[PDB]
Design a binder for this molecule. Structure first.
Ligand SMILES: Cc1cc2nc3c(=O)[nH]c(=O)nc-3n(C[C@H](O)[C@H](O)[C@H](O)COP(=O)(O)OP(=O)(O)OC[C@H]3O[C@@H](n4cnc5c(N)ncnc54)[C@H](O)[C@@H]3O)c2cc1C
Ligand SMILES: Cc1cc2nc3c(=O)[nH]c(=O)nc-3n(C[C@H](O)[C@H](O)[C@H](O)COP(=O)(O)OP(=O)(O)OC[C@H]3O[C@@H](n4cnc5c(N)ncnc54)[C@H](O)[C@@H]3O)c2cc1C
Ligand SMILES: O=C([O-])C1=[NH+]CCC1
Ligand SMILES: O=C([O-])C1=[NH+]CCC1
Lengths: 340, 340
C-alpha cells in the first residue's frame, strides 16, 4: 500500500514507525513517506522540555490516560538498554510544587515512586506549602526525533520537504492512506476551531549540577503559567509560559523576565547558569486529542485518512500510545479492503 | 591562642572554619593555621565521590549517628541558597540495590523520602531483587575544599605546605592547641593499629544524561566492593573497590575492569561515556572515628591535642558533625585555661 504521513514531529515519526513495524511483513510494497514543511530541530517537539508528565487534571477522554500509561511502559522498558540515552531517554526524579493542597494526579500510579512531600522537603521551596515527588523519564524531543528519523530511514521510509496545501493533492498524488500528524497547523488542511495554539517560551541553560526537575503550579494563572526547571541530557530547561490563542512565534522580553526571574528565585544557584538558547513553540491545544479515521472521496478516489494531533503539552508523554492506536485503525483499513 | 590544624582535607578545613567562626569574636589573637603536605586536588577528599550516605550497618559509636545527622541538616539548609553549587552541593536521588533482603539503615529517617523499591522498579535492575530509594546530597570534595580554603583565607587563617614529623615540632613551635586531622596517615605522628587504609579506585566519566545514583551491594564482598554510579556536579563517578590493608597508590588494571564492566552492566548507556579520569585514594578505616582530646607535655609545654580522624568512607558524610564537636572540646580547653 501507499501511506502518506504529514508531520515530522514526535507524532508523525512515531506513528510512521509504529505502522511500518506492524505491517511491513504482511504488506509487500508499503510505501510510507513523510511530508513536512519543517523537520527537526524546527518542530514544536524540539522546543519541548522533554519530561513525561500529563496534566494535573483528568482528560475528557480516558483513552488518553491509557495512551500515557502505554507510553511510559514503552519507554520504561528501555531503561536498561545501552541505546536508551541515544534515543533521548533517561530517568529523572522531581517535585510538583503547589501554593496549596491539591488532589493526587490520575497518573500518580503510572509514574515511579509517587508520594506527597514532607514539610522538611517543602523547606527547600518556601514559596510553596504542598507538593509531590516522583520519578519519571526524559524524552528529549530533538534527540528522539533524530533517532526516529534514523530508524525510519533504515526502515526504507522516505522523507520529503513539502508543505501540503490540502489532503486533495496528497490523495490524488497517489496516497492510499494519509496520516495527519500536522499538529497546531492542522486547521489549514481541514478547519478545526477546537485546535488553538498554546504558546510557550523556554530558556535552555547550562546548569549541569541540577539533576531533579522542579515544576511549580499556579492554579490561578493556568497550567505551566508558573516557573519550572527541567533538566535534560546536555542542558536544563527553564520555562513558565502557556498562552492559548497566541500565535506570536517571536520571543518576548516580557516572558524572558517571568521565566528567568521566577526560575532564578526557585533555584538561586541558577545565577551562575550560562544561557545556551531561548525559544518559543506552539502546543497543539484541543479539548481532546484527535485520533480517528475519516474517508474522503475525490472523484472515485476514496482516500482513507487518520488524524492524530492536538496533544497540547503532553505530546512526548503520549506519542507511543496514540501511534499504537493509529496502527490499530490502519489494520481495519487493511482488512475492510480485504488486503489481509 | 595559637591553634595549629594538621590536615587540609574536608576534616581539617571544616574543623578550622568551625573553630574560627566559633571563637574569633571572643578570642583576641586567634592564630589559626593549617599544616598539610598535600593540598586539593591531592587529598583523599578530592578522590571521594561526594554522596552523603553512611554505611548500611549501625555504628559501634552512637556519636557517629548524630554527627551524620548534624552534617545532613547543615548541608540541606544550604539548599535554597544561591551558593550551594559553588560549595559543590546539590540534591541527588537514587537507589541502593541488594541481591537479597536486608534491614533498613539507621539513617533512613535522616535522608529524604526513604522507601523500599517495588517489584516494578526492581525489574529495571535484573541483577537485584531488593533495595531502597531516597533523596540525599552531593558534596563534591574537590569543589568544597576549594570553597573552605577561600572562605578560611578571607577569615585570616594561613596555610602552610609542611609535612609535620611530630606533634612535638609543632607543640614546641608555638602551638597552644593542635587539631589532628591527618586522615589515614595519622598513624605516623601517633601509631594507630585500628587505623588502616580502605583503598579505593574510581572512574570519572562524562555521562551527563545520568541524573540518579545507583549503589549496588554485594553482602559477601563488603561495602563498596560492588559497582556504584554516583553523578556529581560536572561529571559522573563510577566505583566499586574497598581493599583495606592495601597501601598501593597506583591505579591497577584489574580494578579498572571491575568498575567499568560492572557499571556498564548496571547502566549500559555507559558505553558512550567518555572517561575523564581514574583515581585511587585511601579511606581512613577505623572501627570508630577518633575524636577526643589528649594533653601532651613537652617540657613544661603542655600542648592540648584534639584528634579527628578515621572517617573511612563517610568523611564528606560526617565532617560537619565532627568539626562541630572539636570546637566544643576546644571550648573546654579555653575555659579550663581561664582564657574565657
Ligand atoms: C515550550 C514547550 C514545552 C513543551 N514541553 C513538553 C514536555 O516537557 N513534555 C511533553 O510531553 N510535551 C511538551 N510540549 C508539547 C509537545 O512539544 C507537543 O505536544 C508535541 O511536539 C506535539 O507533536 P506533533 O506531532 O504535533 O508535532 P509538531 O512538531 O508540532 O509538528 C510536526 C510536523 O507538522 C508538519 N506540518 C504541519 N502542518 C503542515 C502542512 N500544512 N504541511 C506539511 N507539513 C506540515 C511540520 O512540518 C512538522 O514537521 C511542549 C511544548 C512547548 C511549546
Ligand atoms: C574512592 C573513594 C570514594 C569516597 N566516596 C565518598 C562519598 O561518596 N561520600 C563520603 O562521605 N565519603 C567518601 N569517601 C571517604 C572520604 O573521601 C574521606 O572520609 C575523607 O576524604 C576523609 O578526610 P580527611 O580528613 O581524612 O582528609 P584527607 O584528605 O585524607 O587528609 C587531609 C590532609 O592530611 C594531611 N596530612 C596527613 N598527615 C600529615 C602529616 N604528618 N604532616 C602534614 N600533613 C599531613 C595531608 O597532607 C592531607 O592533605 C570516599 C573515599 C574514597 C577513597
Ligand atoms: O509543556 C510543558 O510545559 C510541559 N510538559 C511536561 C511538563 C511541562
Ligand atoms: O566510600 C565510598 O565509596 C562511598 N561513600 C558513600 C557512597 C560511596
Amino acid at each position: 500500500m501507499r501511506v502518506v504521513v504529514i508531520g515530522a514531529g514526535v507524532i508523525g515519526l512515531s506513528t510512521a514507525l509504529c505502522i511500518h513495524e506492524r505491517y511491513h511483513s504482511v504488506l509487500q510494497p508499503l510505501d510510507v513517506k513523510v511530508y513536512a514543511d519543517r523537520f527537526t530541530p524546527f518542530t514544536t517537539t524540539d522546543v519541548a522540555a522533554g519530561l513525561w508528565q500529563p496534566y494535573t487534571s483528568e482528560p475528557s477522554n480516558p483513552q488518553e490516560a491509557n495512551w500515557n500509561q502505554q507510553t511510559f511502559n514503552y519507554l520504561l522498558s528501555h531503561i536498561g538498554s545501552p541505546n536508551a540515552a541515544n534515543m533521548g531517554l533517561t530517568p529523572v526524579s522531581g517535585y510538583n510544587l503547589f501554593r496549596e493542597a491539591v488532589p493526587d494526579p490520575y497518573w500518580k500510579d503510572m509514574v515511579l515512586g509517587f508520594r506527597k512531600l514532607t514539610p522538611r522537603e517543602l523547606d527547600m521551596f518556601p514559596d510553596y506549602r504542598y507538593g509531590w515527588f516522583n520519578t519519571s523519564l526524559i524524552l528529549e524531543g530533538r534527540k528522539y526525533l533524530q533517532w526516529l528519523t534514523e530508524r525510519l530511514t533504515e526502515r526504507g521510509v522516505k522523507f520529503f520537504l513539502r508543505k501540503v496545501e490540502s489532503f486533495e493533492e496528497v490523495a490524488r498524488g497517489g496516497a492510499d492512506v494519509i496520516i495527519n500528524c500536522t499538529g497546531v497547523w492542522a486547521g489549514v488542511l481541514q478547519p478545526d476551531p477546537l485546535l488553538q495554539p498554546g504558546r510557550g517560551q523556554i530558556i535552555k541553560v547550562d546548569a549541569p549540577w541540577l539533576k531533579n526537575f522542579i515544576i511549580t503550579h499556579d492554579l490561578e494563572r493556568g497550567i505551566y503559567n508558573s516557573p519550572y526547571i527541567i533538566p535534560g541530557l546536555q542542558a536544563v530547561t527553564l520555562g513558565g509560559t502557556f498562552q492559548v490563542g497566541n500565535w506570536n512565534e517571536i520571543n518576548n522580553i516580557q516572558d524572558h523576565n517571568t521565566i528567568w526571574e521566577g526560575c532564578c528565585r526557585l533555584e538561586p544557584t541558577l545565577k551562575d547558569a550560562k544561557i545556551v538558547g531561548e525559544y518559543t513553540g506552539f502546543r497543539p491545544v484541543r479539548p481532546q486529542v484527535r485520533l480517528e479515521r475519516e474517508q474522503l472521496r475525490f472523484g472515485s478516489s476514496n482516500t482513507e485518512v487518520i488524524h492524530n494531533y492536538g496533544h497540547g503539552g503532553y505530546g512526548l508523554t503520549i506519542h507511543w500510545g496514540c501511534a499504537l492506536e493509529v496502527a490499530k485503525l490502519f489494520g481495519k483499513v487493511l482488512e475492510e479492503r480485504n488486503l489481509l
